[PDB]
Amino acid sequence: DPGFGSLQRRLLQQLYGTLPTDEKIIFTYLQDCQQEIDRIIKQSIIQKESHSVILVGPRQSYKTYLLDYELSLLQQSYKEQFITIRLNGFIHSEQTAINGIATQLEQQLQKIHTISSGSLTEVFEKILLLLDSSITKITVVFIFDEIDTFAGPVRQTLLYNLFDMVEHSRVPVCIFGCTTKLNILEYLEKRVKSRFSQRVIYMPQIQNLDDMVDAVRNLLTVRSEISPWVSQWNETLEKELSDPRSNLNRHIRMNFETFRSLPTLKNSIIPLVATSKNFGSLCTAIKSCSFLDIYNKNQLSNNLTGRLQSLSDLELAILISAARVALRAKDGSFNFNLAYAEYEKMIKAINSRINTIKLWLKKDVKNVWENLVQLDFFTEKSAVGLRDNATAAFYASNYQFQGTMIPFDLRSYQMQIILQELRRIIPKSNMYYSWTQL
Amino acid sequence: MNVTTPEVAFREYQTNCLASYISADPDITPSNLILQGYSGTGKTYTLKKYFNANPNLHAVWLEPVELVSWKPLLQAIARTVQYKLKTLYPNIPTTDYDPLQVEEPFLLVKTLHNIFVQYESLQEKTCLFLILDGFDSLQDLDAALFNKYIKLNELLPKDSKINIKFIYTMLETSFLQRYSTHCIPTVMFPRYNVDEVSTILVMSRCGELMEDSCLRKRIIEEQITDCTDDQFQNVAANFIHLIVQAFHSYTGNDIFALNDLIDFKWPKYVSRITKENIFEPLALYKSAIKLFLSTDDNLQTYDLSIISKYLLIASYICSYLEPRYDASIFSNPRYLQPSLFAIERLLAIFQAIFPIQSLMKANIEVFQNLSELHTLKLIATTMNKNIDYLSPKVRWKVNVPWEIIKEISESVHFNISDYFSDIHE
Amino acid sequence: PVIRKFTKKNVARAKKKYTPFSKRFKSIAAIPDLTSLPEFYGNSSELMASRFENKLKTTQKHQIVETIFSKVKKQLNSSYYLPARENEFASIYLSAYSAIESDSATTIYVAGTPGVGKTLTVREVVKELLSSSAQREIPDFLYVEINGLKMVKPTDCYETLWNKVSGERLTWAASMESLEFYFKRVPKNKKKTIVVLLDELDAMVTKSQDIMYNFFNWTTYENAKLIVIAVANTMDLPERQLGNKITSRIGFTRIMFTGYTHEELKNIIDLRLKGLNDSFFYVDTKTGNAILIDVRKVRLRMSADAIEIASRKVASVSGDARRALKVCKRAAEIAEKHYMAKHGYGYDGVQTVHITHVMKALNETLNSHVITFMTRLSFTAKLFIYALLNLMKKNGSQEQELGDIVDEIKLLIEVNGSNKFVMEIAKTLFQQGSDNISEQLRIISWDFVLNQLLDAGILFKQTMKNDRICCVKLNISVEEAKRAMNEDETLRNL
Amino acid sequence: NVRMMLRRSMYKLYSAADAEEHNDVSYDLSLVENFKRLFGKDLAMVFNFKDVDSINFNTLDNFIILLKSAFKYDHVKISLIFNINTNLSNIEKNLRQSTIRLLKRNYHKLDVSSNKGF
DNA sequence: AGCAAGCATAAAAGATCTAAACATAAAATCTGTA
DNA sequence: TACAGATTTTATGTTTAGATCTTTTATGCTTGCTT
């Protein structure tokens, strides 16, 4: 029936938040800070007053969500009274941000009604001339994500110029800077600190379980009569959320303890409602929440335990022998020779205590060693996994590491899973369980 | 749903999640979706099957392993997006934007915006999926590129009729866990079991093995007559099962290694088939045991001079034996890295161990052989780009394993084992 | 064509000439009277800046409400006299006036901390000089303002200045040679005095320090009528960059701008609110519009004690003149928010700015959110930091290996398993509350909370491939975390 | 490293193709992918590793694995020639078993020496 | 003669950086000569 | 005599060769000791 399809589509677009801004849902626990975001913007686009605000909060804390909902809300009634320039610290550079600002200014000014032509000096001079100078002024709203990446310790000229525009310009400018650092103020240089208004909004956090319960109720309640199942779906959801013993409340509580983030819960729930074929299956899936358990089990299927549970007999024996030789070593390091010596000692002892376990040779254990290294059960003795920057990665690529020079047999490794962890994971019925206790 | 789920053999949850996330409606599909798993876990296979079952989903397949650094990745994205958009809508008049002009992530954003703003003539919003097969496989990879690719979708226009949805199939979980706070929807691909690997191998290789030319010639050469459709399929399935149950410990749950082993050992297995043993698999296995006893995955170690061989012997003895030569000799500790020494000690040990003529002095030839040995990387130093062999601070070390030096010593009839047997055998 | 090893498809180059000014004329005696030529000293460009003025104007606007606190908020702006800078404005003006009247060259180096009124008083000095010259008391001069932080490249100091004195667009090296010839060689009968303000001179001299030497040296030439007013944050920057000998040769006029005291800052704020403090307004009770002299006749007042405390706090902390104004503006904003919430005015007896508003404005800046942030963290993250603190107590070491935190978390869960909360949370921490999920080495959301703390700036983790040896250390004070996990009852009991 | 090996291989390939044929491309495997469209003729790249012993075997192995990705085009043939100064056992020890199995599909051994056989 | 424990310290491995060598390119400017 | 066409000037980009630095383990020296 098309009614259940419409209901499922509505539920999915409620979870994704792509429903019209006339009916977008704002969680109660974050209905307060939105007002602040609603105030500042409405004091800059309506009252034409400059503002400089920094939103501090963790990843997926509804900074961009609230900042875009407010812009959409102001968009439908004050469309021609402001323009929006969006910058992202990850994909914009110090030189590149000037070009981004110029291009966005020209695009938005043509849209409402060049600056982007020339060298970087000319472009910056023109954007300074335009901004840092019946009828009113168009408000320039900077949505400036990852403000901490453009607040480095070597030079902060973009932030300096933007805050100087906020203070000493006749065109109203509103600058919202989203960041996750709790000490963003100390990142700015003292001139930029003085130019900044010290208006930091710390995004709200979930401090109660009732906050997440109400957020889930808002997410999964269809408030528009579009399907015959809407009333029954609301009844089922309310009766599954009212009782604290239900499976949905249990999973909400577990998310509250472990993750405490609505995006994780909605990621768990989206396939729950997309997988169901008819309304009865959806009701049973929301009453039992079996797919939540399946999703959680799948998410934990490539970590150390999941990878360890997918090893053959030879690979497991080599891993246990390497763990033993790393436990014996004072530095926790080893190599192929020591690990193979311990492995062959273990195999000889097992065969002597006796239908006999085959002892593979060095050429037949090199592949197992490489496979275990690929799964990152072993790493180099002193290895940096991935460099933070592109320049650091380039420098590392240029350098020729001593580890690759030495032969494969003598390369010094170091494990990620210790022998006690192997003892805990490995079942007591294994052949090598007696060999996981050194 | 209007999305059809393909029947993948051992990926039912993964296919269900793919159908749940990847949909033709831009409103109910995530901006970023991640497929995680290791080699041979059937992630590209599952995604290809899913996209083939749904011809109404626009996909732009990309292979970051060919695009070593980030600039080729951005340029290839810019080229392929516009090429695909032109392919789907050849009636839309468009201007060509050179992909080589994309040299920054913002330049990619601007080029994508310029490409998408000329497709506003479409009636309904569409989404094309940029599948990046192996974003973890970039050779020049850092921890900041994925941060750029996550937020790339924010700066592009929200109301455009062409939406870009990224799909990443990464390899390592250590890389994925760096971005665990981004809350990107992820589909995990656990490694297959031995039964799953065996079933995949038979269903993927039995048809090709049963039609192989070698079997075609063997059946007519042995003058055999049987059911072509079924008996040969059973023979190939039994061969694959024998290969799996013989080399699972060596290879693990790795499909590619077992495929290579099957390719290597099928001609030898079929060369042992005859009239009597084809009907009874036990006899055929007993007639070809040597195939399944050794992996055979390998495709006088050096032609060095006697001076070079004795130089290597002296270097190994000097490096792996403590400077206690003064007491008795010259008138395992080999499991660890070789130690360091000086040139004079190496020359003294070389003179001590060199056979008499009455002693061998250090000619030009000895030093030339030593420098050649360093050139062939058999002996190394504490070199760092610039190297000066004549500096007193330069110390030498050995780069041969015990087997190579043992073979060299036995070549010149030298008993290095007797020298090294004092500490341990 | 030739195959290119690499390509530069986005190269953007400006239309700037290369030949300096010294090669434009046949000889020094052939240089005309540059003062009367229509392109050098601003006689050509007058409306170039006005070209972009019309791009940011719109013809639509509703009757916006002007709250009684809106006047106070708008008046306490950086732009918006000169109470305290009267013994220093006087020095700058005296030096510049003496240099201008005698067609001489000089250098004024004014240095101080941010927000203390350097650029403002320099601009006021220049405005007074312009007013004096407009009365023909002193020779006319051209005012050029150069800001070191408003330029992409530090060598754009020349490109600007020459363009501001010749109308030509040259490269930076050609501009430098042109300026050298113009200042050293051109006779004083064919020149106008130039007053250059080198705002944020710190940014100009950071790599090659030649901007400082070039700009200070040009004030030593007899023919040059240049007057350089240098602004920097450090009082001894020329003595370091140039050296003692060069700086002694130049002969600066050095002025230091000390931070404002509480009394001077209070006087600044009072002068900023001279006509608005203790004033009267007509307020439309229906819409909220306030007009300065169903209407209501009200009185706007800002308590003097609020200004006292704001000025004293800002003077004690920083001494900024911007910080006190921003504190007062934020207090006015808080009062306006409360007023609008009480009356529901929205957008489109007497009112006062109380001491509590200024206290809130100060507490917003002073307080730190780390303790509040951890108080509301998830139990897994709090357990992580608790194990980190326990390892710090045991080892007395700032950096703890991640394996130590893992083992300590496991030991903490095992030892006090008789606790009801631990007994009921162990399954959800190790098996995700499911019987089909095997016991996990790392607790649920281990990577999530670890990356949360790393992103928040609470932890610093060294980059290494091995995840069991990476050392995580607190980036905050230990006492903050101690208080944060003392607040929680579960971690306090165990 | 791998990026420079790929860039120097693709630059040589493009230069040789343009010379034999008598716009601009990016120096990566997309050139190998689009060679049939650009020049209209199949591709027969022959790599010659001059001093395999001196070459870092990690980057050589990574480059071989990268070149393996070019096998999905029907218009390309890739041959490799390793100039070895020793026996191939050193290369076997210094290469991953996956690369060894990949090379074992087609390989020929040639004893190139001036003094070989006297 | 022969060697274990404690200490300081020269040193190996590598992060982080600079800069010369190698390379490309648009605007201005020199340079022929019809 | 103005011209196109060759050259220089200014401005970054790509890659290799060489440097200094921190960080951590090897190492000669010293002390105490028995053959």
Ligand SMILES: Nc1ncnc2c1ncn2[C@@H]1O[C@H](COP(=O)(O)OP(=O)(O)OP(O)(O)=S)[C@@H](O)[C@H]1O
């Ligand atoms: N424009 C949007 N409309 C609707 N939902 C959105 C929008 N942007 C983000 N979301 C969703 O909002 C949730 C979290 O909000 P976000 O704004 O993405 O997080 P965040 O505060 O931006 O964290 P950052 O920016 O990475 S530090 C996720 O489920 C997003 O999918």
Ligand SMILES: Nc1ncnc2c1ncn2[C@@H]1O[C@H](COP(=O)(O)OP(=O)(O)OP(O)(O)=S)[C@@H](O)[C@H]1O
């Ligand atoms: N469920 C399956 N059913 C049938 N064949 C499968 C299945 N999963 C994998 N295969 C086959 O096994 C091989 C796996 O190939 P891929 O799916 O490309 O591996 P992968 O997961 O992409 O790993 P990488 O990182 O790409 S090497 C192919 O030859 C597939 O045909």
Ligand SMILES: Nc1ncnc2c1ncn2[C@@H]1O[C@H](COP(=O)(O)OP(=O)(O)OP(O)(O)=S)[C@@H](O)[C@H]1O
């Ligand atoms: N004497 C004063 N009287 C009134 N207002 C003042 C006074 N001094 C500073 N202000 C205000 O505070 C602001 C400080 O600006 P500046 O004078 O440029 O400070 P500053 O010395 O330039 O600090 P920098 O440029 O960051 S080193 C001015 O714009 C005024 O709004």
Ligand SMILES: [Mg+2]
């Ligand atoms: Mg964001």
Ligand SMILES: [Mg+2]
């Ligand atoms: Mg793949």
Ligand SMILES: [Mg+2]
């Ligand atoms: Mg200033």
